[PDB]
From a paper:
Human p97/[name] ([name]) belongs to the type II AAA+ ([name] Associated with various cellular Activities) protein family, which has two AAA+ [name] domains. p97 comprises an N-terminal domain (NTD), two [name] domains, D1 and D2, containing conserved Walker A and B motifs, and an unstructured C-terminal tail. Six p97 monomers form a functional complex, featuring a double-ring structure based on the association of D1 and D2. IBMPFD/ALS is a genetic disorder caused by a single amino acid mutation on the p97 [name], promoting [name] activity and cofactor dysregulation.
The structural results revealed two major forms in the molecular population: the p97R155H dodecamer and the p97R155H hexamer-p47 complex. We reconstructed the 3D density maps of the p97R155H dodecamer complex at 3.34 Å resolution and the p97R155H-p47 complex at 4.30 Å. The two p97R155H hexamers are oppositely packed against their D2 rings with a D6 symmetrical arrangement. The nucleotide-binding pockets are empty in the p97R155H dodecamer. For p97R155H dodecamer, we did not find densities that could be assigned to p47. Our cryo-EM density map of the p97R155H dodecamer was able to show an apparent density of the partial C-terminal tail (residues Q764 to F773). The crystal structure of the C-terminus up to P774 of an engineered p97 variant has also been determined, but at a weak signal level. This is because in our p97R155H dodecamer, the C-terminal tail is sandwiched by the two hexameric D2 rings, limiting its mobility and allowing visualization of high-resolution details. The C-terminal tail points away from the pore center, interacting with another C-terminal tail of the opposite neighbor to stabilize the packing of the two p97R155H hexamers. Packing occurs via largely polar-polar interactions between the D2 α helices and a hydrogen-bonding network of the C-terminal residues (D749, E756, Q760, Q764, and R766). π-stacking forces between the aromatic side chains of the C-terminal tails and the D2 α helices (F674, F682, F768, F771 and F773) also contribute to the packing of the two p97R155H hexamers. In the absence of nucleotides, the p97R155H mutant prefers to form a higher-order p97R155H dodecamer, immobilizing C-terminal tails and prohibiting interaction of p47 cofactor with the NTD.
Numbering used by the authors:
A (entry chain A), B (entry chain B): 196 to 428, 439 to 588, 593 to 715, 727 to 773
The structure:
């Protein structure tokens, strides 16, 4: 009724995506007179594909309301609920009603329900509703000024005839709300929750991971009810204090759904967490930023931008936080495909779900498609074989497919660079290889400073001394130095509280440098001298300058 | 009629889960005025998923009755029983009836029947009743003060569109009744059974395993009929004496259904059944208790709590009773995933049934997810392969997926620590490894005392002498020392009864110390000196301190 009015301010979790919606379906609706005189063909379907509970209904209702177009809702399960032959009547009546109110927004939510994948559709009446929808979008694409968007979980779950042109051509990935998106969603949902000012709304927004807007509403709901069941007695009702302990309890008891849906997000590493690596930094800038931030020069000199690069080197030396950093300078959506995902695709024989990954990269462009641990499969069949894995081959196919445009950069990184498919290293594919060595003294002092950031560390601790002592230490070992110093600070502080409460009732404010000594006593240089030796042998396998130096004339 | 009134006292076998129901659907029903003034969004579906016959109908009816909400039941097979067209009419009639009695509890038991897995639904009417149920749950989520719970066997057997938000967002694992839960259920079902005071009601509650409340009712029933068929003649009917022999007979001929349904329970090991292992005990406290009992300290010093630990060591040295012990101090539910279960997933190619275990840990949080014998698969393909097994990779996937919140701790323990996936031991994954050695003198005297507990053992026998003579004996060797000493006492006692009855009619009160020589003659040190040698070699493989000792400045 009067509640649904929903506007742009009431929508959070999507800024670029909602702006994309506005540039798609507000100019040809608010002022279509300026539109068709040019001769430009209007969109006639905006297939909003995203995880469930992102409030896609609220998004489309806000876009319709702040345009004035008559938002008419077609509930999917409602259509499938009605008997055979009345669902087709309801669909045609819906489109006919919406062409009356000529600026209209038809929003067929749960398009999976009425029109799933064509192999799933079983009955003929369940194939006369998909067909009726198809002919409706054709006839209302060619006529009557109505624009029909729909909300789906994924773009394989829709009948492929709907993605054909004229029908649902456009797609908008509503996706997971990111950290600032979760901030906006918490502010909207906590407009009236009247916290006790202990809640940041920012720290919780950072430590909610895999939480769509419905999950954030559930989080605020359970936190408010923890406040209610903590008060436990009408004026005392208005004096409820939703304190940060309630939000931490709600987080500890929140079941999120948006995990296993990979998140595209500009990461926060800023090239100072990964210090050093200066020549690698220059190569990554020249490979990512220069194609996208200075693309005129590339088309001037005729150079095609490289499709991909391939890190390699010792494990846990700052390879993942070295593609996040360059995705942060590029301000590109960062898509990390971890090794277990590639392995899962290699074991289920579902080698066609990496088409979906590259497609998601295409929509989320510009990208840094960090195929982390690209040699997981080659380790998993160490040995009858020899090359060309199941899904490595599909990675090659969808890597050769996309053009040097669309600014999608694959930065797949391998611990073992020799067991990988040698067809990956062909030109056009991940031809540039970049050795990521063990941290240099600047690099590991930056690593030690970054791992100890947000942790209360002393002033008399000499972190450059630590970084100067540690030569062969990989980045992961330098984390485990700090995560055994923080852990021992935990032990000492808790033991302090324990012998205080049992005796003094009846503090270790910071990680003192005597914790960084007995924590450093358990220091394991995890990468051997024979691992980095082989990585150097592969590195100068890729160095065959050999006499063409001082090529003068 | 008047019989169904059922209350909280009449429900047993679930305290935390029933209290969760109290905090879910008792506050927003008795006093909803205190609720919606805050702006908190009410629950609108409580998917009570649990094994069949846990009295879920009785649970929902008791919660409604002690609330006053109009419990109205939608029997699943009743809906599927009516012909096509009026099953949907019965659904709409049910919802429109319950929105009249504005505080109401719809309880659609056997939601598997009306809405199974979406692939399983075959006819179109079986897909118009799920769709009708979906649109009804949407319309009654957004309106009419009414809340709709439904009992299922598992959360895979339900159509995935029901678990979407607005629809069945909440889930409650009613689960297996534990030992004290079985005590409560036994007392409820044995209120009027008028025992002979020989029945403990507690010992029988301990030795019924995998028994849901209906199985306990069947147990009391078969015991009562054994009393009836032991009496075998109206006043003699009132003088029936249900003696513990009847309960033992009924327990020996009870067919339980709740086996193969993994039980979550705070176990009973109390950390002195496994004596010794003091440094291991301190690491386990620092890893489990300190993250969950003192969690503000971790967020102060910025430490993310470690996701999991990996025991290793000689077989049967107290590794399972070393994770139950820490799950007991933590008061966390304990989920043991034995090696045959992982192997069963590796052979059936059902690598996606370990997603269900991690989900079960998430609902049953905080947990100790003891993947006992994590190297079952690697032993089962000892040898073209090399690493990264079918379901070990899925364990890595849903181990990396969940955050350091939710307090789910994985303690997967391996006899052979080198054949396991090296990707398990990466940081973030089961990074801590804890060698579990053969018992020391304190540890094996505690093992001997615990194995001989509840068994009548003499005073003159020195268990410190036994623990002092056994050096290379693993804990299992010490069990077969005591389970051959008990067995010799059995043999000698039964032989005494035999030679008494055949001659004296026509006692060995305890395990005397002259049986502990005959048992100890067959003393098998089952773990060799070259097995523990390899485990210590792996231990120093994990000890690479190497000169960073005496790190001063």
């Amino acid at each position: 009724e009067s509640l649904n009015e929903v506007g742009y301010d009431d929508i959070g979790g999507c800024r670029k995506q909602l702006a994309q919606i506005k540039e798609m379906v507000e100019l040809p609706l608010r002022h279509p007179a300026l539109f068709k005189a040019i001769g430009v063909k209007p969109p006639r379907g905006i297939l909003l594909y995203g995880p469930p509970g992102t409030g896609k209904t609220l998004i489309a209702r806000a876009v319709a309301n702040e345009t004035g177009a008559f938002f008419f809702l077609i509930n999917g399960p409602e259509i499938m609920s009605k008997l055979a032959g009345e669902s087709e009547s309801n669909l045609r009546k819906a489109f006919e009603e919406a062409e009356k109110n000529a600026p209209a927004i038809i929003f067929i939510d749960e398009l999976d329900a009425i029109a799933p994948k064509r192999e799933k559709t079983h009955g003929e009446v369940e194939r006369r509703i998909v067909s009726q929808l198809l002919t409706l979008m054709d006839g209302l694409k060619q006529r009557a000024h109505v624009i029909v968007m729909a909300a789906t979980n994924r773009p394989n779950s829709i009948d492929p005839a709907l993605r054909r042109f004229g029908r649902f051509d456009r797609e908008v990935d509503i996706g997971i709300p990111d950290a600032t998106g979760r901030l906006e969603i918490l502010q909207i949902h906590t407009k009236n929750m009247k916290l006790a000012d202990d809640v940041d709304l920012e720290q919780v927004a950072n430590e909610t991971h895999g939480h769509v807007g419905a999950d954030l509403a559930a989080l605020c709901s359970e936190a408010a009810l923890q406040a209610i069941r903590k008060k436990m007695d009408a004026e005392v009702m208005n004096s409820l204090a939703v304190t940060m302990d309630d939000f931490r309890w709600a987080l500890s008891q929140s079941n999120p759904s948006a995990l296993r849906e990979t998140v595209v997000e500009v990461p926060q590493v800023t090239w100072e967490d990964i210090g050093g690596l200066e020549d690698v930094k220059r190569e990554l800038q020249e490979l990512v930023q220069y194609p996208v931030e200075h693309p005129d020069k590339f088309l001037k000199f005729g150079m095609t931008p490289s499709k991909g690069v391939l890190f390699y080197g010792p494990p846990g030396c700052g390879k993942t936080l070295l593609a996040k950093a360059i995705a942060n300078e590029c301000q590109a959506n960062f898509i990390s495909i971890k090794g277990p995902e590639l392995l899962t695709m290699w074991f289920g024989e579902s080698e066609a779900n990496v088409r979906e990954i590259f497609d998601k990269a295409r929509q989320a462009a510009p990208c840094v498609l960090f195929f982390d641990e690209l040699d997981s499969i080659a380790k998993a069949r160490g040995g009858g074989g020899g090359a060309a894995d199941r899904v490595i081959n599909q990675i090659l196919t969808e890597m050769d497919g996309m053009s040097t445009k669309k600014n999608v950069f694959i930065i797949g990184a391998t611990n073992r660079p020799d067991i990988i498919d040698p067809a990956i290293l062909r030109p056009g594919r991940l031809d540039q290889l970049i050795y990521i060595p063990l941290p240099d003294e600047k690099s590991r002092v930056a690593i030690l400073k970054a791992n100890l950031r947000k942790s209360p560390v002393a002033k008399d601790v000499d972190l450059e001394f630590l970084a100067k002592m540690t030569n062969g230490f990989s980045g992961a070992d330098l984390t485990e130095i700090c995560q055994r110093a923080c852990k021992l600070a935990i032990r000492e502080s808790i033991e302090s509280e324990i012998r205080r409460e049992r005796e003094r009732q009846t503090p270790v404010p910071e990680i003192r440098r005597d914790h960084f000594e007995e924590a450093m006593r358990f220091a394991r240089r995890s990468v051997s001298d024979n691992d980095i030796r082989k990585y150097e042998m592969f590195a100068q396998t890729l160095q065959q300058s050999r006499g063409f130096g001082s090529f003068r004339f």
